[PDB]
């Protein structure tokens, strides 16, 4: 069981390294891409609203 | 007492033996991959904000599609896109699930792994490499005709080097398999070797090697997928 | 004496040579590929994404021979051919 | 010993791989490709919509 | 000292040297060709597609030696010529 | 006559020495070449210094670790000599 | 003992030396020539057809010697001079 | 034929191999890094100040290998494992 | 044990070493000279005609070194010095 | 037989390997450093006066490493560890 | 056995090592010098006459060592020191 | 069996290794230095003389290492340390 304890400590160290150094940047990249997709969707909605308003104005004109 | 080899829960059927350890490892990898795939299929939204699983899967798809488009038109050979993608994830999981703390002592002072990466078993790499070999050779046959394709590969890019070209094709499958196998087989020894160290010292070299093993497994999965795509492109050019 | 001892010593020497050659080749090839990558990035600091693909292709091709040699050394020193 | 020598597992493992590929072929790649194509179409439609809104405002003021 | 023991030891050593030399050659050639490819891509991205045609051709030669050597290695260790 | 263990251990020692020599040659050459590339890059683009440390450490990561991998095998040969009697 | 055992062990070692040296030389030479060809094609795409003329002239000079070595390997291994 | 004699002879040969390989690697790596530094200083006389910081790292990643091999050489001849 | 056995084994090993070194040198030298020729021809086609003149000198100084080695290898194996 | 004979033979082989590796490393490193220095002077002559300051550092490592090997060869040859 | 056999085998192996190393060095040096000459003539055709003097100054040096090395090979083989 | 025969065989092998390494290093270093000198003279003929100072500072050093080996080989072959 000694080697089992050793590899358990090694895995704990690996997990600590991942959470401290790797998780923040990867989570940041995922958040950035999610925000970009949401911004693209909002841009599509705003463009549709712009078209609707422009068409309404043209009909008024 | 390194105890190299010694496949566990081996079983014989139809006169052929099977390493049950590799079968179990491959089954676990397949279960994980299928779970991820169905989680994506049941929670993929084209309109709303994408989820993490969808983001990862579409990143993989974009990478492989861009590689194909760069090498051989994605329109010409669509069936490469799924295959390569699959391969990638497969290899990746087979090289990352090993990180889990599943090493103990088999009541004899020798390391024993509950789960071992199937790539450490020659059968896994041979199966994948041979399947890819048949796949792109058959694709080339379909593209350039049954008689034309062997002629084209034998001729190569220059006629008078026809012999070497043959060797090259013979090296395509083997090079695909052994490399991958080694990249994992070495690990199977490394960790096992470190098991001989005292427990109070085993953690540090074990941690360093396992981190580098994560990185190497990622690299090898990417290389295998990319080389499969490249060989497909080379086999599907007139 | 024991013939198996002689065969095992020969296998160990052969495996050592295999690993030495493989390590030399892999180290020098990886160094050269990394040199190309670093020079390309220094010339164009915003080209990492484009260069990382061919660089990794090169890394895979160079390490193919080295890890094939490692597998053959493992065969030599764990399942020695011709052993009695 | 002789671990390098291929075994019968060669067959079994291959089977499992195909299974996974099946899923990845039919329930991962097609949906993702459709999603990517639809997102690119949405972006192009947004660009065209902005251009057409500008054009329509210009025409409305003209008329 | 059975003669087969000496023959097997010599064959293992010879195969080890063959594999070491092939590995070194393949690694160095692969690294050099990959450095050339990486520089070509960094300088001219649009050339990437047309750089695989020559690159792999040279790689096609670089492997030809190594694997050929590997082939003869199989003759040394398994089908040891002159084995008694 | 002589103890077969003697021949086994002599072969293991020679093999380990060869492995370490080859690994050290590879590591030295690779690290030197990568460092030359890095030094030239820093000389030409000092403002890009940090941007260069990323790829370089990959090369070193691929090179140095390879050396250390060989190290393990040498430890296997000398201390855990396979085929020992 | 059987002297042919020592003879064949030495012959196998010599063949291993020959093939290892030939493989190293062929691999490195082909890699360097391929680097030259790749850089030339990257700089001058229109020269892709032209550069093949000297490149092969080089490759043969690299391959010839290597292949010559291979021939002598057979002489060492299959029909060993001085065998008795 | 004392077994310890064979053990010590093998240990000496292995330590010599270790030292030779380490010396080759360290010498060539230091030479290449110094060539890079020399070119950098020649092109940019004032760059010297910064150029040392990365150069040392190269030496650190090269000399260290030597300083590792050296230690293992002591592990071979000074305290030979397996010797009785 | 026949003294001729040991003498011939040593001769075969020495000839193999000579051939391996000669092939390494010849291959790498031919590759480097061919790389220079390739770059020269790529830079301007008109140079080709002149470039072959110095090039043939370089190869002349490389293959010669190879051929001399070959002769000695023969002298080592076919008529072993001090064959006793 | 005298075991010390085997001890001394192995020690001499090890020392020869040490010095061969050291000389290879020293020669190649000094050549590369000198190439850098000569190119730097040719590109911009009057920098010679300063270019020595880094150059001597480079060679300073190279020779040192090789010279370190020197000492250990003596240790192997003149005061052999494990000799009785 | 006969001391002549062992001494002759050792001398033959040593001479083979000498010649292999000399051939490797000569091949590499000639290739590098020829590459420099080829590049110089390609860039500056008029320099064809000018560049020969340095080139021959280089080749000579390189060649010298090889020939010197070759000379000692003879001393090893035809005039084996310590032969008896 | 005479132990002095074993000692002399080991000494011959060591001297062969020493010369092999020295010749390889000297050849490669001199070739590299000559390449630098030729390139410099081609680019900047007016500075040819200024180059011969650093050049001989380089080659000299390399030769010294080689010549150093030349001494020790003699000590190995003629005044073999450790003779009974």
Automatic annotation (TrEMBL), chain B:
NCBIfam families: ATP_synt_6_or_A (TIGR01131)
Assembly mode: F-type ATPases have 2 components, CF(1) - the catalytic core - and CF(0) - the membrane proton channel. CF(1) has five subunits: alpha(3), beta(3), gamma(1), delta(1), epsilon(1). CF(0) has three main subunits: a(1), b(2) and c(9-12). The alpha and beta chains form an alternating ring which encloses part of the gamma chain. CF(1) is attached to CF(0) by a central stalk formed by the gamma and epsilon chains, while a peripheral stalk is formed by the delta and b chains.
Cell compartment(s), UniProt: Cell membrane; Membrane
One CC-aspect GO term: proton-transporting ATP synthase complex
Top-level taxon of origin: Bacteria
SUPFAM superfamilies: F1F0 ATP synthase subunit A
Record keywords: ATP synthesis, Cell membrane, CF(0), Hydrogen ion transport, Hydrolase, Ion transport, Membrane, Transmembrane, Transmembrane helix, Transport
Protein name: ATP synthase subunit a
UniProtKB/TrEMBL annotation, chains C, E, G, H, I, J, K, L:
Main location, first listed in the record: membrane
Alphabetical UniProt keywords: ATP synthesis, Cell membrane, CF(0), Hydrogen ion transport, Hydrolase, Ion transport, Lipid-binding, Membrane, Transmembrane, Transmembrane helix, Transport
Localisation: Cell membrane; Membrane
V-ATPase proteolipid subunit C-like domain location: 13-75
Membrane topology summary: Multi-pass membrane protein
Quaternary structure and partners: F-type ATPases have 2 components, F(1) - the catalytic core - and F(0) - the membrane proton channel. F(1) has five subunits: alpha(3), beta(3), gamma(1), delta(1), epsilon(1). F(0) has three main subunits: a(1), b(2) and c(10-14). The alpha and beta chains form an alternating ring which encloses part of the gamma chain. F(1) is attached to F(0) by a central stalk formed by the gamma and epsilon chains, while a peripheral stalk is formed by the delta and b chains.
Protein name listed in UniProt: ATP synthase subunit c
Organism annotation: Mycolicibacterium smegmatis (strain ATCC 700084 / mc(2)155) (Mycobacterium smegmatis)
């Amino acid at each position: 069981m000694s080697i089992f304890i050793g590899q358990l400590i090694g895995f704990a160290v690996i997990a600590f390294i991942i959470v401290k150094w790797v998780v923040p940047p990867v989570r940041t990249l995922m958040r950035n891409q999610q925000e970009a997709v949401r911004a693209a969707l909002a841009e599509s909605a705003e463009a549709a609203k712009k078209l609707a308003d422009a068409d309404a104005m043209h009909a008024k004109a | 007492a390194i105890h190299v080899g010694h496949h566990t829960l081996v079983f014989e059927l139809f006169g052929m033996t099977f390493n049950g350890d590799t079968i179990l490892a491959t089954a676990v990898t397949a279960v994980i991959v299928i779970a991820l795939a169905f989680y994506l299929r049941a929670k993929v939204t084209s309109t709303g904000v994408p989820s993490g699983v969808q983001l990862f899967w579409e990143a993989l798809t974009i990478q492989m599609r861009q590689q194909i488009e760069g090498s051989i038109g994605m329109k010409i050979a669509p069936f490469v896109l799924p295959l390569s993608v699959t391969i990638f994830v497969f290899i990746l999981i087979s090289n990352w699930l090993a990180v889990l703390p599943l090493q103990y002592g088999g009541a004899d002072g020798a390391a024993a792994e509950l789960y071992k990466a199937p790539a450490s078993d020659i059968n896994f790499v041979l199966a994948l490499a041979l399947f890819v070999f048949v796949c792109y050779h058959a694709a080339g046959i379909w593209r350039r005709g049954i008689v034309g394709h062997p002629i084209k590969v034998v001729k190569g890019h220059v006629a008078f080097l026809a012999p070497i070209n043959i060797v090259e094709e013979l090296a395509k499958p083997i090079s695909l398999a052994l490399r991958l196998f080694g990249n994992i087989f070495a690990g199977g020894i490394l960790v096992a070797l470190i098991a001989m160290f005292p427990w109070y010292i085993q953690w540090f070299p074990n941690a360093v090697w396992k981190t580098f093993d994560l990185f190497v497994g990622l690299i090898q999965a990417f290389i295998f997928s990319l080389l499969t795509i490249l060989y497909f492109s080379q086999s599907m050019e007139l | 004496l024991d013939p198996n001892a002689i065969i095992t010593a020969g296998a160990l020497i052969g495996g050592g040579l295999i690993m030495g050659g493989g390590a030399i080749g892999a180290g020098i090839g990886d160094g050269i590929a990394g040199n190309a990558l670093i020079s390309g990035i220094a010339r164009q600091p915003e080209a990492q994404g484009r260069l990382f693909t061919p660089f990794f292709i090169t890394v895979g091709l160079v390490e193919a021979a080295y890890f094939i040699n490692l597998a053959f050394m493992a065969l030599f020193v764990f399942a020695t051919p011709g052993l009695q | 010993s002789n671990f390098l020598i291929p075994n019968g597992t060669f067959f079994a493992v291959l089977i499992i791989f195909l299974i996974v590929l099946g899923v990845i072929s039919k329930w991962v790649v097609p949906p993702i490709s459709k999603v990517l194509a639809e997102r690119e179409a949405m972006l192009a439609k947004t660009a065209a919509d902005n251009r057409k809104s500008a054009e329509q405002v210009a025409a409305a003021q003209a008329d």
